[PDB]
Every structure is written in C-alpha cells, then in structure tokens.
Design a binder for this molecule. Structure first.
Ligand SMILES: CCCc1cc(F)ccc1[C@H](O)c1ncc[nH]1
Ligand code: NA
Length: 567
C-alpha cells in the first residue's frame, strides 16, 4: 500500500458485477454503495444513472476506477464539510488521514461522526486509547479484520497493516508452541490427572450423595469441590489431544470456550469451596451450633450462590474470541494465544481483580481458619493429656505435696475440657442434652476431685491416693468415651493444613501470580518472557483435583471407608 486509493482497493476489492457485500447491501466496483433495499432492480436503477448508461449489471474495468476516484473525492468533501470530522482530519498525518477516509468510505460521513470520543482521542494524538475505543463497536463486530487494519493504521501511523498480513506470534511464544514442553510434558501430566482425578472425585461425589447419611455442611462443600473437579477433568481427553497435535484446536470456538470456562471455574470454585470448608470446620470447633438440617440447607444455598457468581465472573472468558489461526505455525490455538492484543488492558485488570478478591482474600480466611482450628484442637489435646498424666502421678506419689499438687492441676484440666467441644458432638449445640451430659460427666469427676482434695488438705495422705482409683473409674465411664480419639483428630487437622498449603503452593499461587505477570508484560511490551512459566503454572494448577481426594480423606469419615475398602 502507498496511498488512500491503494488502501481502499485492498479492503473493498474489485468486482465488475453487482454483488451483495458482507451485510447484504448491493454494491459494485470498488466499494461503491448502490442502495440499501433487498431489490436487485432497485440497485440497477441507481447504477444506471451513476454511470450514465445501462450497464445491465456489468460495468467495465475502466468505469470502476472513474467511479471509485469520485467516491474518494466525495468522502473527503464530506469530512471537511463536517464540523466534527474537519478538525480531527486537519490534525492527522497523511497516513492516518487515509484511515479516517477509509472509515468514511465504508460507514459514510454521518456514521464516522458518531465516534465522538475516539475522534477526540485521535485529535489529542492518543493512538492506543483511540484504538481500544474503536475495538469495541459494531464496526469491529461486523467487520473485525477490516476494522483491525484501519485501527492499526491509526495506532501505528504506517501502511504496515496493508503491506504485511498476520503470519505469526512473537518468537518466544512460537518456540514454546512448537516445543516439547507443550506437546509432550503437558499431555502427560494432563493424562495422569485424568486417570487419577476422574475416578477418585467420581467416587467421592458418589459417597457424598448416596453413602453419606449425615449431610453436614462439610459434605456439601466437598461435593461441589468434587463436582468442580469432575466438570473440568471430563474435558481433558480433548485437552490432551489438543497438545499432542501441536496445540491445534479443531473442535470449534464454542467448545474451546467451554473448556476455558470450566477450567477457570474449577480454579476459583476450588479456592472458594476450600475457604467455606475450612472456615466451617473451624467454626464448628470454636463456636458450634445445633441445626444440622438447617445449616445444611444454608450451605447448599451458599454453593448455588458461589456457582452463579463464578458463572457471572467468567463471562469475559466465555464471550470473547479465544481461538486464532497462526499461519506460520499452521495451528489453531485455544486460550494459549490472545486473538485480540487490544484487550490486554481489560485482561490485566480482570485477572488482578480475581488474584486479590478471589485468591488472596480467600487465602487469608483459609489460613487463619486452620490457625484457630489447630490451636483449639491442641488445647483440648493438652487437657486430656494433663488429666491422664496427673492422675497417673497420684498413684505413684508418696508425699502429701505431690498428691495435693496433682489434684489441683487435674482439677483445672477438667474444668477447661468441660468448656471444650468433644470430638463426637460436633453438630450438637452447647445447650443440647448430649452436651449437658458431657459437662455433667465432669461435674461428677470434679466433685470427686474435691473429695480427694478434702483429704489432701486434711493431712490424710494415703486416703487421698485411694480416691485416685475412684477417679479412674469416673474417667473411663463418663469422660474417656468422649476424648478417646481427640489426639488422632488433631493429627488429621494438621495433615489437612499441610494438604491445603501444598495445593496453594503448587496450584493456586503460581497460577494467579503469573496470570497477573503474564498480561502485565503483554500490556507493557507486547510480549512476556514468563510465557513458559505461565504455561507450566496453568498445568500444575490442574493438580488440585489430584490433591482434592486427600482433603476428603481427612474431613469425611465416610469417604475413608470407601477409600480403604477399595484398596
Ligand atoms: C484447549 C484448552 C487450552 C487451555 C485452556 C485453559 F483454560 C487453560 C489451559 C489450557 C492449556 O491446556 C494450557 N495448559 C497450560 C497452558 N495452557
Ligand atoms: Na478442585
């Protein structure tokens, strides 16, 4: 391309017969509009008086140029006539002047005058902002390839958009998209995840629905967690095939956006449902309640709320073009390459919003939940331990000092465990009969400790020791039943905290951090060297559905049975 006339020939083409354009309007020659009515004869009448003769639908190669050269002169006249088009045009360099005339040639004088905001940007020499504004319009929607070339002309001020057609991405990306990292490493890891995560979550989902007859809020969160897992792993056979064949998608744009949707869905559902589960289980320890049926219904509603909120927040991933054909690579990439480099500004803010509000914020609530959970389970452990240890001391103490001392320490140890929630009565309210019998079991014990203290304070040494065997009976009858396996419960919480931390360290943190970094560099330089790390990050993020079964194992008691029996 050299000038306006040469530019338009490339956009409008050259046809000597009346044809329907992309929208359906009958045109002829080089982008010469005849009429906007669905009538072949109505276009004939407008052509005959435009030429001067009866062309009968077919014009000459010479008459095309003569009519084209007049359309350009009129397109310019309208620009200077227009109060909104003239000042911008007077500010634009000859290259950008052609781009403006190209728009007027296509949408007419009035149409282009509607772009008031973009024209102001072009006048203020703000090429990038103007380019973005123009990228979101019906103009871009109806004729994207056409609009891109013109927009690029505005942005760059060169004829490059008409000299060089798109051929390839940056070199660093093209090497990755042809390298073994994507074509060998990824499909292997993804295959593993498919074999491991699908049946494990498949069975977990089955247990939570058809084998768990508790239906506690924890089960419900884990059921959606398993559901989020499944709804992504099922698409992996198409995901694996994609990479094996050199990152080439041949299943359609809609089906690509499906995979993309459910990918980021599981990405964020997992975090949110982890935050729910962790907080819920921590909350049943610090401040337990007793509406296991109502608390369940609530947890279901919360899950629906989360599912719909993510369906709404992943809209700018569903609705945007996510496939692009790269001529030099002869492949059609899904997700891995952004088809429209003008939307990077929107993409950056978007993944920065999520990285804060749907990553850090739930991570903060998730970590501190285990902080309160572990400590509370550690205190109850210390109580049960202080009880047994001091009770074992009395039977092995000779002096009156060690006897009175152990009784006093054992007394306070039982008074703290009394206020604490037993491992069994989790969904039981603190005012329930079950809890009242639990506390009463300590009241009987504590009273007996006072009866041994009564002897220990009255100098009756050996007689207070005999009371210890009476305390043993009270322990096994009323207390040990409840605190038998509280130290085993503490160990499960810790392993759960380790499990979750690893999931954050491997699947969540590398992904969300780099997602911001990736689009930040494309926004700043047009390319990112972290592209390889971005890919590895996204790959390792799918491991969460392989780590998720370990979560169900440390929380669900029913899942353990089906886990152990199977293997
Ligand atoms: C066809 C689906 C392509 C896709 C879509 C996503 F939403 C996330 C990752 C990938 C892709 O598998 C990948 N892994 C690592 C980097 N890119
Ligand atoms: Na998950």
């Amino acid at each position: 391309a050299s000038n306006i006339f040469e530019m338009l020939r490339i956009d409008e083409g050259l046809r000597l017969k009346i044809y329907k354009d992309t929208e359906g309007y009958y045109t002829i020659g080089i982008g010469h509009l005849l009429t906007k009515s669905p009538s072949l004869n109505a276009a004939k009448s407008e052509l005959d008086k435009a030429i001067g003769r009866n062309t009968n639908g077919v014009i000459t190669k010479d008459e095309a140029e003569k009519l084209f050269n007049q359309d350009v002169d009129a397109a310019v006249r309208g620009i200077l006539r227009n109060a909104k088009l003239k000042p911008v045009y007077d500010s634009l360099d000859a290259v950008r002047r052609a781009a403006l005339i190209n728009m007027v040639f296509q949408m007419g004088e009035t149409g282009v005058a509607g772009f008031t905001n973009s024209l102001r940007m072009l006048q203020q020499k703000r090429w990038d902002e103007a380019a973005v504004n123009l990228a979101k319009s019906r103009w871009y929607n109806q004729t994207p390839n056409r609009a891109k070339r013109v927009i690029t002309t505005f942005r760059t001020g060169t004829w490059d958009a008409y000299i060089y057609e798109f051929f390839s991405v940056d070199e660093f990306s093209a090497s990755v998209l042809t390298g073994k990292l994507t074509t060998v490493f990824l499909p292997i890891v993804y295959t593993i995840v498919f074999v491991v995560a699908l049946p494990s979550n498949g069975m977990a989902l089955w247990v939570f629905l058809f084998r768990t007859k508790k239906k506690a809020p924890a089960v419900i969160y884990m059921a959606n967690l398993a559901l989020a897992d499944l709804l992504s792993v099922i698409w992996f056979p198409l995901k694996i095939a994609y990479h094996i064949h050199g990152n080439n998608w041949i299943y359609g744009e809609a089906l690509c956006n499906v995979l993309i949707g459910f990918f980021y869905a599981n990405m964020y559902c997992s975090i949110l449902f982890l935050t729910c589960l962790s907080v819920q289980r921590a909350w049943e320890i610090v401040n337990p309640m007793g509406h296991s049926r109502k608390k369940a219904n609530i947890a279901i509603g919360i899950s629906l709320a989360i599912w719909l909120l993510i369906l709404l927040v992943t809209i700018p991933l569903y609705v945007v073009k996510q496939t692009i054909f790269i001529p030099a690579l002869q492949i059609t990439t899904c997700h891995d390459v952004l088809p429209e480099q003008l939307l990077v500004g929107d993409m950056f803010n978007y993944f920065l919003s999520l990285a804060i509000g749907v990553f850090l914020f739930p991570a903060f609530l998730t970590a501190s939940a285990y902080v309160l959970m572990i400590r509370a389970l550690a205190d109850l452990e210390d109580n049960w331990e202080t009880l047994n240890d001091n009770l074992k001391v009395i039977e092995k103490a000779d002096n009156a000092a060690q006897v009175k001392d152990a009784l006093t320490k054992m007394r306070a140890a039982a008074l703290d465990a009394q206020k604490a929630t037993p491992p069994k009565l989790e969904d039981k309210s603190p005012d329930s009969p079950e809890m009242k019998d639990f506390r009463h079991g300590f009241d009987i014990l504590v009273g007996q400790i006072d009866d041994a203290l009564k002897l220990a304070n009255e100098g009756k040494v050996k007689e207070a020791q005999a009371a210890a065997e009476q305390l043993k009976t009270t322990r096994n009858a009323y207390i040990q039943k409840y605190l038998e396996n509280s130290e085993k419960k503490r160990k499960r919480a810790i392993k759960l905290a380790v499990t979750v931390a690893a999931m954050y360290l491997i699947c969540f943190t590398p992904s969300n951090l780099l997602l911001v970094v990736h689009y930040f560099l494309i926004k700043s330089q047009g390319q990112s060297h972290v592209y390889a790390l971005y890919i590895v990050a996204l790959c390792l993020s799918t491991l969460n559905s392989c780590i998720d079964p370990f979560v169900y194992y440390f929380v669900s008691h029913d899942f353990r049975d089906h886990a152990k029996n199977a293997l």
